[PDB]
Amino acid sequence: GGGSKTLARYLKPYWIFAVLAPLFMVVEVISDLSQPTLLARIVDEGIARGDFSLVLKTGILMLIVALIGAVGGIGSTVFASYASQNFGADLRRDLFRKVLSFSISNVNRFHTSSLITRLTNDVTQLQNLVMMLLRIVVRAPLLFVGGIVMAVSINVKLSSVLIFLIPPIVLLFVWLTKKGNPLFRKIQESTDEVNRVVRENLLGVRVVRAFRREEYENENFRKANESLRRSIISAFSLIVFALPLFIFIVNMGMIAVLWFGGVLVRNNQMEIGSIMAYTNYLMQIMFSLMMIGNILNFIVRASASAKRVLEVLNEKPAIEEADNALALPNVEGSVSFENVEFRYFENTDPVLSGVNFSVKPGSLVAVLGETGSGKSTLMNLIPRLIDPERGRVEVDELDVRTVKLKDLRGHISAVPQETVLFSGTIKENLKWGREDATDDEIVEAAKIAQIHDFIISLPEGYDSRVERGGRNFSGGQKQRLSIARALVKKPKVLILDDSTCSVDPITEKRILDGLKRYTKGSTTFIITQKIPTALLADKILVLHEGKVAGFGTHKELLEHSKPYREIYESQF
Amino acid sequence: GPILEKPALKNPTATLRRLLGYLRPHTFTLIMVFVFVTVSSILGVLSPYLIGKTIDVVFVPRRFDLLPRYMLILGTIYALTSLLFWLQGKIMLTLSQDVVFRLRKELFEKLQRVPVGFFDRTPHGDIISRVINDVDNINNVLGNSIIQFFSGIVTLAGAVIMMFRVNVILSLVTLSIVPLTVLITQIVSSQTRKYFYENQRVLGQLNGIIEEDISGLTVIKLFTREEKEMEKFDRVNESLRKVGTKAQIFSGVLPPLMNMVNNLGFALISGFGGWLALKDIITVGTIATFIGYSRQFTRPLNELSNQFNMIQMALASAERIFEILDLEEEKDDPDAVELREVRGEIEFKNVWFSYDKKKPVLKDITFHIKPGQKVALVGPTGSGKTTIVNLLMRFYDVDRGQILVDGIDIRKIKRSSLRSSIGIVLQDTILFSTTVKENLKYGNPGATDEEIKEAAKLTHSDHFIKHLPEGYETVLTDNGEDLSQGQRQLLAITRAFLANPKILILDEATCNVDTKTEKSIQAAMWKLMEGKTSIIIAHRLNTIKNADLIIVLRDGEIVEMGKHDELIQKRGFYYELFTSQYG
């Protein structure tokens, strides 16, 4: 239930760095707390006692302390930087290595957008929290507490004033937090709405401009813009009040140190210089206390990231290969579904149910169906990307669950409708099937895929540059570039999704024609909703609402399969 | 963080003045504030002076009767200081939050007016991102960094003027950290920016590998790329590991180094000051006062440098924003006529259009459509049939040639009238994050909630609308994400109906459409087209057969033109484009 995995493991190998940091900080805090004491003693023992030696010597001594605190502070910044960084690498690496082992079941749990933000934002948030802990979570509470101890040691009685400056501020902080927190959310809400309005007026400029209704969006943008002016003028009127109030109290306690400190000098209890010192320590407590205020506000957020990052490490891979799984030297390419029932999310209806069929090695089956008929689950089922609830999936009458994945998957190529390319050259992308592939082998399959002409019309042709995700090329160019990359693999099973439809300029038919020429000795599924796309196929599997409707040729199917007549009626 | 390069401002003084015009209607309120900061800044440099007295006056010569006279003087000065900070902030809040309210209005309106080209050319995100940041930069400097800069000038000169008129010797001792502070800060601020970027590089590369691999995870397993992707990550991570450290040290050594200057100051003021009191040259109270100016020459000097740069970056952000406000808007020429009630005939005369003006898109396109005639537009990717739509709504203009609806050239018709007689449904339809009823109404403002039902009935959309959770008032969050694509297409059709146009451009997808809706949307296409001129980018066999004309296209040129049976009987590019499809 959940997981016993813990971020403290990642900081552990750097514990030397994680203690040198706060230790070099206590060097600084002390070095900082000594300066006002050495001022009282400068006056109360040296000005008011005519020893230039004292003043000279404790004047030199102050410099030597001031330089130490620097070696201290710098040192605590060098170390807490090593610690927080190393930690970040290590947590990020373990995170990535986790998302590489995830299955489609996993990447659906966290959504894919989230998965990223954890692997990037959160890793840096945590990386900050560590840096913070190791230096100013040690600094701020020592300067605070240390400052009080010094105050009391200077003069116990005057310390009473601390009980009249410290609670009003701690109340100020809590009151702001409990009352400011919902209003800054109310800012994000109104920011979002401005973004929304401005976005939809860019995404749909062509509609609103056509419908002669631009002024309705000006009216729609005003509501956003006013909802934003009010949510900010409010939430920022608190801040602009709290800070000066904070300064006043800090200033008003100064008064209480000079006033009450005026009676202790009279009644011969307290030296003049010890009042000077006391005022400094008063300050060093009041701003330190404020730092501790800002720190907590960071913690609660940095806290949330540690939850999400912990989830991703406590997630378990939904597709595991058995310890004694069969290796697959070759694969013939028969593909069979006994009573497969499949569903992506454990809340919805079965995308498939009792799906039966079998395909012989080298067949060219058309997996015809409309959207939602579960036709597109084939892509994810044959290479073990999801396991079905009931039923087997078999390749070469072997259960897929029973074979080494690197073997099974290395023999299947899928060409999904949504395609993704990777930052390097085109020739690097295409060799993703086989690195030892030769230029001619690469060109062979690029030609079948109908892309060798377009690639060659590039300034650097194959060695041209692919940008991230394939953002530089058009959808259809990505589609065929993905097909050409499938074909370099020499797959024994090859699954193409002719859905959605994008794109076709007639060159689609050219591809399926060239496929026949090389699928020779290889099974090929071709998930389509187009009838003509299904007519090149030697046989047509028809899916309707998750159950097989008919598995045969056009003429057989035209008779029985009521779904197939209905589809055929929709297209012709 | 660190600024990359100083902004290239094309004559800042010019843009400064124009910017200085946005805050002219609140001048008196702006002058009121600028004296608050003044007296608050002066009252600031006073308090350390008064504590010097109070020490010299009440404390050293024991005269503690004079005490509450002083502690009433301070105690009120304090109260006023925090009375101005409040006002010279609360006033600035509403004032600055008003200025950027206007610029949001002005910008968003230009959005409504600017050519559809500016949108089409640059990604949407990059424009919102750069505009909204250039606006926040204006706000922030206006409602803070200006007064924070100005204040610190007063407070600086103030605390210096006073410091010297008390004692010079000591003044020269304490100001000898201003050479330290500025020497340290700049050395350290070089190394920081260098490494900040060096790191920002390696790290953005890393998140590339991360975002791209998570997106196409499916594709990484299918190809077994895990070990290779892992090794690519690994190499970039150990890189990041070493730089991120250098970047992190150098960005966090200033506070400890600034403290070191804050304490070296406090030690020359105690060491010289206390050796100036032994010589009876200064008083102890005097020592306490310079302690009150010791930390006024470090971070306040640093807040000064950074606030300057922040102003500078805001001036540039203005210049960007100003330019967006200077873009030309679409104007209906003074002669432009309202559309006379015609059944709508269309004619292109040798039209040539290029988007980039370097790669021609349309070449010598000539034809003539007569009322009530359904026309089909066929061709490959880059045929140029998708470019026709934008030229009939005059989103773009024709380079060479001329278009004309009902005789009159489009560039002499009113853009308002034009787009009313012409309705449009595209493959990439657009819905709104409002209720269903609001979407269908959008086309016709003055529509009743019966015509909406009645016209939703005819186009087969009324059925599924009544089966939606909230019925007709169902909010389509994220623009209809919880809807079947067919159903969305159906809705987009129904709203073009209520706008009752006399010319209709169509483009109906078929790809994530279930067959059941398919029967519905094509029936609805029918009812929409009757009594309307209909140019169609068809993807269906049932429309290119029953068409009244078919303009086959290629390379932005007209290869053929005629009816179905004829164009098949000619056996041309239509035939190939047909028989290698529906054969």
TrEMBL record, chain A:
Binding annotation for Mg(2+) 1: 376
User: Record's InterPro entries?
Assistant: AAA+_ATPase, ABC1_TM_dom, ABC1_TM_sf, ABC_transporter-like_ATP-bd, ABC_transporter-like_CS, P-loop_NTPase, Type_1_exporter
Q: Which residues bind Mg(2+) 2?
A: 376, 417, 497
Which compartment or compartments is the protein found in?
Cell membrane
| Record-annotated ABC transporter domain positions | 335-570
The entry's ATP 2-binding residues are 474-476
Q: Where are the transmembrane segments?
A: 15-39, 59-83, 136-154, 160-177, 232-261, 281-300
Q: Which GO terms describe its cellular component?
A: plasma membrane
What is the protein name given in its UniProt record? ABC transporter, ATP-binding protein
Q: How does it sit in the membrane?
A: Multi-pass membrane protein
| Pfam families found in the cross-reference section | ABC_membrane, ABC_tran
Keyword Transferase recorded: no
Give residues annotated as binding Mg(2+) 3: 376, 497
Source organism (scientific name): Thermotoga maritima (strain ATCC 43589 / DSM 3109 / JCM 10099 / NBRC 100826 / MSB8)
Q: Which coarse location class applies to the principal site listed for this UniProt protein?
A: membrane
One GO MF term, please? Answer: ATP hydrolysis activity
